[PDB]
Ligand binder design. Structure first.
Ligand SMILES: CCCCCCCCCCCCCCCC(=O)O[C@H](COC(=O)CCCCCCC[C@@H](C)CCCCCCCCC)COP(=O)(O)O[C@H]1[C@H](O)[C@H](O)[C@H](O)[C@@H](O)[C@@H]1O
Ligand SMILES: CCCCCCCCCCCCCCCC(=O)O[C@H](COC(=O)CCCCCCC[C@@H](C)CCCCCCCCC)COP(=O)(O)O[C@H]1[C@H](O)[C@H](O)[C@H](O)[C@@H](O)[C@@H]1O
Ligand SMILES: CCCCCCCCCCCCCCCCCC(=O)OC[C@H](CO)OC(=O)CCCCCCCCCCCCCCCCC
Ligand SMILES: CCCCCCCCCCCCCCCCCC(=O)OC[C@H](CO)OC(=O)CCCCCCCCCCCCCCCCC
Ligand code: HEM
Ligand code: HEM
Ligand code: HEM
Ligand code: HEM
Ligand SMILES: CCCCCCCCCCCCO[C@@H]1O[C@H](CO)[C@@H](O[C@H]2O[C@H](CO)[C@@H](O)[C@H](O)[C@H]2O)[C@H](O)[C@H]1O
Ligand SMILES: CCCCCCCCCCCCO[C@@H]1O[C@H](CO)[C@@H](O[C@H]2O[C@H](CO)[C@@H](O)[C@H](O)[C@H]2O)[C@H](O)[C@H]1O
Lengths: 534, 534
């Protein structure tokens, strides 16, 4: 076939035969955690493309028009050109509503996917040496992704977006030397300003996407260069990777998971409404709603402003407003996240070149601090949303603010305590299995009447008839007998009937032969590791 | 110093020591041609950054306002928001005029730098195998760079831009099935349309810059991967590169030439006016000027429309306008440029893996066709500008159109004839020197009265006392004696006086010793090439 001619013509010119061989043969581990990041990547792809489709219709201008579009309930209402063009996307373009909702849902999925991916990186310990650079890059990404998404939903100039813009401007003006100067620099004047929405539009469609794309490219390039970490397991060492090659069996799975995420987004974009701007009306600074919170990924920085106890300083001709302290708090919160691996180094007392991951149970301090930060962030989030929470679940609004205040101290401590003790209990169960074997659950009575539970050893048994303890290795310990194969089906066939018996027996024989062959190869690989380590 | 600690910390994590060594040791030839492309690259950098500064002030909206800005001569004039914000850049922002002019001059320098770089690639033969891909990429770049720049100067919605937009729309609507449909797709309706300037704005600031950046990145990456071509010379072969390493002596020169181009742009941006929009007035479809040509890089496609002899087809209920044929012509013109290396292959009868460049004199057909295309393009350009040409140089406007028409046939033929014969004469001079030696110009009279000119041989001399001819090698042949060193200064020192004589003599001795040492090393390298080729 002419495919060989194409390949020849390519390689005779570019000599890629050595390199692409090395690329296709790279090995990637197959844990389920290790494609959370791919979700964020796929969401970003969708964010790009749907965004580019929205720009052929959106007009980022704060100057007014008397609306005369397809949405009849606002004919004659004087509105910003931004809001009018967003409405024309929603109503006058075939399927523009579908697209706009997909863009928004993709933004939410992108941010939460980054959050969960970062949680995996934090708990499993993958940020450690040499990979802390990917942490410093990645934290910047999850900051900018929020910064972008915020100004992304600020653009339509509806009533719910402009209040968040008002909040941002009023926070900037309050800074204790340069606030007025920084505000006049950013907005080009007092708020609302003529040049405001175009600066934010270009910041949203060109600048921050360009930076995110560059940083994501560098991130993935670095992950590819220094190969992926892995969990401890049979035959795994600090100096090797066990998994599947990037093709055929991994690239197709990446394509398939891309398809799944893509289609999931296209479903939820048509089936759930998001940001129904047409019933919010255009922005004017005199109007506000009871539930006027920012997007979900910004609710934490709303909740901070809700829980600060109004401490304000007056110094003669000057004043530090009460909102400077939430800026300090949120900055400290961001600094701690940004610089984490080094404050981990200074107290952990090690600088080793780790390539194997820690199970979160085996590192109770870090996982306890992670759950502590999770409850802190969640209390900030729900305090941001407490207006809705109190309205729906009928808890007094003052009680919600005080729950946020006192909880941001107390609840983290309770989280740390419970998380630490639970982790210790988990690893105690692991040791109990490794030194006594699995508890099958089969209870038998001896002739003496003693009730005994037969335990099924994993390692060899002493001549007294009891297991010899194994050393814990960091790999997961099986805790039941269905996880050793002992509940697998003996019958073969589909629904409504069996396979013929000859096929049945031969298939089961081949299955068991493979099951012992893979055990043998992993066992020999582990023994080779022992020999090669001395 | 702590620099060593930084380097250690880096390489212990990323292991870049092998790779960056290989990068810094890459060799690049030093011909003056081989940084024309860098000019285009630097211009593109400037185009990006100055453009990003212009977007904090520009508002791409076709909806109107009564102007009240700093430019008093248009107070009260109702104008588009685009035009008003461009005026506010020019007059209300400190130094916005300086920036806007720099952006425009950078665009012109970018396009002409691409043109001259491509001319180098065409004449020297660098497009040949394996590098034709860089040709196919590069031609696309020099198309899109023009497409962008056109819509770049269309954005302000002034009177001179909107006429070009009118021309584009009226050409699109004339296509012989889909013209009306394609126009309604692109513009969102009839011209001028509400969504027009925002589609062009996003196409100008996001889409085409993103594509140009990606293609330029791929272009430079490919040039780096397969190493740069070189001219034939002493010690040069198809299998090696002779020049300087990318650092220290090349990277600093790249920085320095970047500085020179940058500062040149900053000078000419403040010293020459470009596109003085403030005296053109806002666009309205009923008004036009005598000199209303598009930008310079679009004048060719204007000139085509000027020289087409109005051939129009009528078919019952349908008509093919007279402007369809210029579309066909310009498309043929672009196709020929895009697909050139293969129509070079089919008639040249070779598919070899060339790495040494051809001097343009040695390939008279291709260089003659190149000058033929140059005169064709220049006649198209000046026909595009003939309204100005006839007004200034006092040649009748009809005579200019007929000069364009008949010249686009005749002048290419004359160019081919003259270019071919001149190239043959050049290489004849080269052979004459190589078989008779340099003509010094020293004329002496023999005792017989015969007037002789002493010739200075390059190669050995036969026992009859006359040079043995050398075979031509494609490298330049020296044609005078000042190019062999024989006019170099014997004195040393600055203005107003000499160096002391001891310093003088020692410096000259070292100079001549180095001059013979480099000759010896190149001679030995060439002999090694002969031995290694057999
Ligand atoms: C939770 C139950 C305590 C609670 O709600 O306490 C509120 C203040 O929050 C708290 O201390 C919450 C403490 C949370 C602790 C951390 C978990 C204050 O009560 P409030 O919501 O203003 O109700 C009014 C009465 O106070 C007032 O006496 C009465 O005269 C009425 O005016 C009544 O409406
Ligand atoms: C160049 C000199 C020839 C020239 O200009 O020819 C013009 C048409 O172009 C040409 O053939 C240019 C040929 C170029 C050949 C390729 C090089 C036509 O003359 P035109 O410009 O209209 O001047 C009018 C008189 O023709 C008309 O008789 C007279 O009564 C007036 O009306 C006069 O104004
Ligand atoms: C991190 C947040 C620091 C808030 C400091 C407020 C000081 C202030 O504006 O304090 C001023 C305020 C009066 O002080 C008070 O309310 C006294 C208590 C201040 C906070 C003590 C902890
Ligand atoms: C490349 C440009 C092709 C132009 C074809 C015009 C045919 C036409 O619309 O021809 C129609 C037109 C009548 O024909 C004529 O003027 C006759 C001459 C046509 C061109 C002959 C070369
Ligand atoms: C849009 C943002 C991001 C994208 C597209 C992304 C993508 C990826 C992908 C695909 C992987 C490999 C597969 C996997 O680990 O699941 C990865 C690994 C990694 N990510 Fe991210 N990620 C993003 C954000 C972050 C954040 C927020 C952090 C941490 C603060 C981070 C730190 C890391 C590190 C250190 C690795 C390598 C860990 C290892 O090799 O085991 N990344 N990233
Ligand atoms: C090529 C990059 C992007 C482009 C061109 C783009 C374009 C746009 C445009 C024009 C709008 C306003 C028009 C409308 O409401 O439909 C918008 C809104 C929005 N953007 Fe983007 N965007 C891009 C990337 C992103 C990214 C990376 C995120 C998230 C981090 C994001 C999140 C949002 C959100 C949440 C909205 C509000 C949607 C709505 O209110 O309906 N966008 N985007
Ligand atoms: C903005 C557009 C372009 C940029 C930034 C660019 C940049 C460069 C640079 C820096 C080089 C190496 C140094 C030099 O040759 O002077 C190069 C080489 C080259 N360029 Fe371009 N160029 C552009 C457009 C083009 C065009 C329009 C063509 C042809 C149609 C082209 C074809 C080539 C080829 C084939 C080479 C390699 C030739 C060799 O190795 O001798 N490029 N380019
Ligand atoms: C990041 C990429 C770019 C951005 C953000 C950008 C931005 C802009 C903006 C906003 C304008 C109109 C405002 C004004 O008149 O001052 C403009 C005009 C223009 N652009 Fe760009 N541009 C970019 C790249 C380019 C490129 C690559 C070219 C050339 C190929 C180009 C050529 C032009 C020209 C000729 C004008 C007209 C200038 C004038 O009329 O004063 N631009 N650009
Ligand atoms: C993936 C991306 C592209 C990769 C490019 C690198 C691989 C190039 C493969 O190139 C291809 O190799 C096979 C190897 O048998 C050659 O195949 C040929 O081998 C011999 C010559 O050696 C012939 O007698 C035989 O009939 C034919 O199959 C093709 O002539 C060559 O075109
Ligand atoms: C350019 C981009 C960065 C490149 C990084 C790769 C190069 C890293 C260089 O790393 C640096 O090498 C020098 C080589 O003598 C080492 O230098 C050290 O050598 C020996 C140990 O081998 C010491 O006794 C000696 O006192 C010290 O000079 C540094 O401890 C190491 O930090």
């Amino acid at each position: 076939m002419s495919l060989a001619t194409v390949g020849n013509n390519l390689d005779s010119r570019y000599t890629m035969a050595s390199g692409i061989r090395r690329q296709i043969n790279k090995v990637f581990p197959t844990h389920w955690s290790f494609m959370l990041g791919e979700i964020a990547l796929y969401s970003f792809i969708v964010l790009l493309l749907t965004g580019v489709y929205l720009t052929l219709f959106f007009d980022p201008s704060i100057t007014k028009v008397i609306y005369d579009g397809g949405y009849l309930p606002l004919n004659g209402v004087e509105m910003s050109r931004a809001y009018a063009t967003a409405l024309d996307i929603s109503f006058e373009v075939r399927g523009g509503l579908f697209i706009r909702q997909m863009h928004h849902w993709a933004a939410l999925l992108f941010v939460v996917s980054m959050l969960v991916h970062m949680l995996r990186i934090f708990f499993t310990g993958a940020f450690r040496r040499p990979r802390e650079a990917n942490w410093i890059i990645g934290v910047v990404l999850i900051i900018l992704g929020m910064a972008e998404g915020f100004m992304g939903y600020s653009l339509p100039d509806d009533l719910l977006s402009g209040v968040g813009l008002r909040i941002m401007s009023a926070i900037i003006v309050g800074l204790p030397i340069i606030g007025t100067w920084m505000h006049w620099l950013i907005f080009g004047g007092d708020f609302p300003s003529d040049l405001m929405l175009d600066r934010f539009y270009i910041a949203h469609v060109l600048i921050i996407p360009a930076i995110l794309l560059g940083l994501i490219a560098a991130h993935l390039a670095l992950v590819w260069y220094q190969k992926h970490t892995q969990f401890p397991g049979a035959g795994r060492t600090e100096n090797n990777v066990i998994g599947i090659r990037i093709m055929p069996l991994f690239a197709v799975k990446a394509v398939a998971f891309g398809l799944i995420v893509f289609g999931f987004l296209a479903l939820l974009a048509g089936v759930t409404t998001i940001n129904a701007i047409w019933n919010l009306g255009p922005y004017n600074p005199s109007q506000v709603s009871a539930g006027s919170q920012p997007d979900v990924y910004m609710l934490w920085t709303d909740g901070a402003a809700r829980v600060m106890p109004a401490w304000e300083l007056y110094l003669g001709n000057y004043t530090i407003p009460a909102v400077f302290w939430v800026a300090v708090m949120l900055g400290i919160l961001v600094v701690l996240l940004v610089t984490y691996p080094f404050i981990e180094r200074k107290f952990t007392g090690d600088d080793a070149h780790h390539n194997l991951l820690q199970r979160p149970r085996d590192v109770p301090v870090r996982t306890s601090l992670g759950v502590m930060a999770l409850v802190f962030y969640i209390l900030l989030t729900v305090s941001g949303g407490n207006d809705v929470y109190a309205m729906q679940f009928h808890v007094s609004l003052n009680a919600m603010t005080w729950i946020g205040r006192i909880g941001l101290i107390v609840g983290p401590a309770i989280a740390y305590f419970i998380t630490y003790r639970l982790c210790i209990g988990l690893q105690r169960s692991d040791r109990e299995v490794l030194e006594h074997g699995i508890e099958t659950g089969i209870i038998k009575q001896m002739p003496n009447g003693a009730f005994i539970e037969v335990h099924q050893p994993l390692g060899p048994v002493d001549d007294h008839g009891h297991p010899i303890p194994l050393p814990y290795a960091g790999a997961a310990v099986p805790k039941q007998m269905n996880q050793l194969g002992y509940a697998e089906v003996e019958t073969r066939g589909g629904f409504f009937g069996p396979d013929p018996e000859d096929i049945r027996a031969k298939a089961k024989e081949i299955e068991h032969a493979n099951h012992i062959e893979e055990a043998n190869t992993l066992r020999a690989l582990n023994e080779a590791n022992i020999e090669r380590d001395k």
